[PDB]
Q: What sequence folds into this?
């Protein structure tokens, strides 16, 4: 489990990486299995989370395989671990305020 | 049907000859018998398909015989001998009375009462062996 | 001691390059009907659907190879048809250079025509001639056929427009239900109608309303909530909802009605929690759109002068769940365009017949 | 051209495997019939050339012409050795084809060499 | 059976015998006429390539070895037919150079090679 430290209110880049570099479908969930982000083809789709207006991803990097998550306005109650499901590899990354 | 359609006509060359002189020349003949304007082009293509819907029909009619010879042992052999004993109940004639004074057409008027039974006996004799 | 055979009825499940077959016209300058004369043969005049006798085959829907063969050609269809004036594909080498481009861009016509996907020499297509086929598992009555039915490449999110409808009850199919990351392709048994008109009062230009009947929509979604409790519990209180967010193309039911990309608003269409007139969709023609073919934005010409309308046949519902208990939140989804055609190519499979087995008999 | 007949039983296949060859105005659309007249005839030359390219494999393994041929390569135990009784009783030829996945590629590799061993055996007497 | 089937005429006959056994708008409303007409040319070439294979399986059948690639027979060589040392004509010689050598006797080999099967047809 990787852990990323962001102080308060900044923007982090919880990275996640594929292999074949062709923008396959991914997602980002949490401990209660609630969707943060979501790729849908060539578009982007959020989910009913606490980061509903706080989540975004770099769109130009999807073709290279990197599928990061960038959270802005880092509050105190977002400390959890996040599940990036590229093909099957749920690479967990934990977050601390 | 220029490819293997002229082969089937060449089989009937020595009809009415005697049975010995017609079976002797099978090997000889088969080596020798196997030897655009605007309105035009949408009609001259159907003259190219219909000349291939019969030329291919000469192929898959010829290969429906080698699939039949291959079941009874020998495939590719014209003259071929088999391990099945000739019952005298088909015809009660000596071989002196057969390969000397008969033509091949008279066999279809003589053993076609039994010619589906022989094809079953030629099946198992090269199935278990 | 093995025994080779050469008569066995054994077919693999292979992948090949199919060829399109569309009922083209060759004089019309509709931009679908000029591609369908260029890369499609006409319809097979003598089509034959032989029904296989008593074979059951384990299909799969989500790993098909026709739905990534189809996606290669409607990507290739929307590059000749709708050439935008300004297109920004993010070429990269953070240093991603947004490579602009420019070309001619005249206004054109646009309607989906049915397209059959045939099979080449030596291959077959195994239709799943059933009624309750849930996408994965053994189809019981698998017939065979050379070409598929008339499939029209209508690209839309949140609502599978103009597609074929189930003769049995409302089907629900997902790759793994209770995953909360896979879409749930509902398919209607009756065609819900929808009008989508841009009006003629020239004042706004880019503003339209869409009317769906209140009698049909409350009854059709009344069928969906029943069979959603089939794969779920019997007393779950499911909650329909607005779409969450993201881009405009997946938050809102987007399509293309005669060359102009509509962007509707289905918040009044999913506004009911289920237990135990005419809705008006405020739409908007957009002009700076994202592309579904690849990553990158594209800009088009302003809309045309006259009245723009297209009455339709919504026959699909690409919902999406979220994982708290005793309820379910079902907000709409769609946008990955492979789901827009595997909703219509689910009962097909391409095989090839391999007649050479080596059975055990232990002969000598 | 040699297709199958519905499968549906392994044992009843081998009885009917033999009999598949043991006995036997428009003028308006001249592109609907000319294009589909070639595609229905390109699928009849391929059904001939796949037969000749598969009598070429059975010609390598000495099995040329015979539908049900028998050969002298013994069963390894590592090729999914199931019950030899119920294989012919209640099974289709599709279900048996799943029962060997990648052993088909190495079953064929012995038959090419066992004939070449038999080529070095019949000419060594 | 094909026509572009052996364009692998390399150098070593010993290696050649090894691989002897292993074997968008251009339309202008006329691109369905280019693919239909030249579809026939790819069918008149493939069907004739079948009927050349069947014409030769009867010729290998007269020599007894039908349906098989490497036919080993029961007739020896001679001195008139380029009596080399079986190293210069099997490891460093292309088939085209070998075919150009014995071309004077290919019609002479085929006569006796038929007779060598008819003698093996006498003991039956
Ligand atoms: C689901 O399927 C249905 C069934 O096909 C689809 O509904 C059809 O949709 C198309 C377009 O949306 C529509 O076609 C129009 O029909 C009109 C007559 O009914 C035509 O007049 C009109 O042609 C004009 O509009 C085109 C738009 O680009 C122009 O390119 C064309 O040259 C014509 O333009 C003239 O008129 C306009 C004013 O309208 C003016 O500005 C121009 O200068 C010029 O004078 C279209 O062909 C069909 O009628 C619809 N079918 C039905 C039964 O209503 C539906 O679209 C499908 N769903 C989806 C999502 O695609
Ligand atoms: C259907 O399956 C049964 C199984 O007992 C079999 O006997 C029957 O032959 C099958 N039907 C056909 C048409 O083969
Ligand atoms: C479907 O998703 C659930 C939830 O993660 C999981 O337990 C199950 O194994 C999945 N099914 C398959 C076939 O993987
Ligand atoms: C849509 O419905 C509203 C209210 O029922 C009505 O005023 C309007 O005229 C309708 N528009 C069309 C195009 O039917
Ligand atoms: C759609 O419009 C057509 C004609 O304008 C009308 O016949 C039909 O009833 C309308 N449907 C709905 C649901 O408004
Ligand atoms: C109409 O919708 C309400 C909820 O909005 C639902 O309770 C009711 O059952 C629906 N009507 C019918 C006839 O099903
Ligand atoms: C639709 O989404 C918007 C923003 O996400 C929200 O303001 C609105 O309330 C939603 N509609 C419904 C019916 O919840
Ligand atoms: C239209 O969408 C807006 C947000 O995009 C939302 O607030 C509103 O409720 C929607 N209204 C309808 C009728 O869909
Ligand atoms: C839609 O939902 C809102 C709040 O969720 C409610 O006030 C409104 O009456 C609903 N509209 C309909 C037509 O049910
Ligand atoms: C919508 O579906 C109905 C089926 O009842 C059909 O009659 C109608 O023509 C369809 N409309 C289209 C395809 O535009
Ligand atoms: C071609 O010639 C080179 C040099 O003699 C040799 O190394 C190579 O193997 C040859 N390749 C073929 C295909 O004959």
A:
């Amino acid at each position: 489990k990787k852990v990323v430290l962001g102080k308060k209110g900044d923007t982090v880049e919880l990275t996640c990486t594929a292999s074949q570099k062709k923008s396959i479908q991914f997602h980002w969930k949490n401990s209660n299995q609630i969707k943060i982000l979501g790729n849908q083809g060539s578009f982007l789709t959020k989910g009913p989370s606490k980061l509903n207006d706080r989540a975004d991803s770099r769109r130009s990097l999807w073709d290279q395989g990197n599928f990061p998550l960038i959270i802005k306005n880092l509050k105190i109650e977002d400390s959890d671990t996040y599940i990036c499901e590229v093909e099957d590899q749920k690479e967990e990354v934990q977050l601390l305020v | 049907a220029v490819g293997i359609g002229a082969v089937f006509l060449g089989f009937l060359g020595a009809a009415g000859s005697t049975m010995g002189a017609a079976s002797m020349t099978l090997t000889v003949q088969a080596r020798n018998l196997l030897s655009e304007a605007q309105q035009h082009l949408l009609k001259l293509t159907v003259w190219g398909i219909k000349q291939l819907q019969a030329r291919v029909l000469a192929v898959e009619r010829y290969l429906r015989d080698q699939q039949l010879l291959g079941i009874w042992g020998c495939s590719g052999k014209l003259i071929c001998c088999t391990n099945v004993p000739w019952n005298s109940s088909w015809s009660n004639r000596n071989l002196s009375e057969i390969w000397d004074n008969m033509t091949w057409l008279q066999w279809d008027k003589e053993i076609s009462n039994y010619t589906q039974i022989i094809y079953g006996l030629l099946e198992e004799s090269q199935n278990q062996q | 001691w093995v025994t080779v055979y050469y008569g066995v009825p054994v077919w693999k499940d292979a992948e090949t390059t199919l060829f399109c077959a569309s009922d083209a016209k060759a004089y019309e300058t509709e931009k679908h009907n000029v591609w369908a004369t260029h890369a499609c043969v006409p319809t097979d005049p003598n089509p034959q659907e032989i029904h296989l006798e008593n074979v059951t085959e384990e299909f799969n829907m989500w790993k098909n190879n026709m739905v990534e063969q189809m996606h290669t050609d409607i990507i290739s269809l929307w590059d000749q048809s709708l050439k935008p004036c300004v297109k920004l594909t993010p070429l990269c080498v953070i240093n991603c250079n947004t490579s602009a481009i420019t070309q001619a861009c005249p206004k054109v016509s646009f309607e989906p025509i049915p397209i059959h996907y045939c099979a080449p020499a030596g291959f077959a297509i195994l239709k799943c001639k059933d009624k309750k086929f849930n996408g994965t598992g053994p189809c019981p009555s698998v017939s065979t056929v050379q070409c598929t039915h008339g499939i029209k490449p209508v690209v839309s999110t949140q609502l599978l427009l103009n597609g074929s409808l189930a003769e049995e009850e409302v089907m629900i199919r997902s790759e793994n239900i209770t995953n909360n990351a896979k879409n749930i392709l509902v398919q209607f048994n009756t065609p819900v109608q929808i009008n989508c008109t841009r009006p003629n009062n020239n004042t706004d230009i880019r503003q339209a309303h869409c009317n769906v009947s209140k009698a049909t929509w409350n009854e059709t979604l009344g069928k969906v909530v029943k069979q959603l409790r089939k794969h779920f519990g019997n007393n779950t209180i499911i909650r329909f909802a607005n779409s969450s967010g993201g881009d405009l193309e997946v938050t809102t039911h987007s399509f293309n009605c005669g060359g102009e990309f509509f962007y509707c608003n289905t918040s009044g269409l999913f506004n009911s929690t289920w237990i135990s007139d005419s809705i008006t969709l405020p739409c908007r023609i957009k002009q700076i759109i994202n592309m579904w073919q690849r990553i990158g934005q594209a800009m088009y010409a302003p809309p045309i002068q006259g009245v723009i309308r297209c009455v339709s046949n919504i026959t699909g519902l690409i919902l999406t769940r979220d994982g708290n208990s005793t309820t379910e939140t079902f907000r709409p989804g769609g946008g990955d365009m492979r789901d827009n055609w595997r909703s219509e190519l689910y009962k097909y499979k391409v095989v090839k017949i391999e007649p050479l087995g080596v059975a055990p008999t232990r002969c000598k």
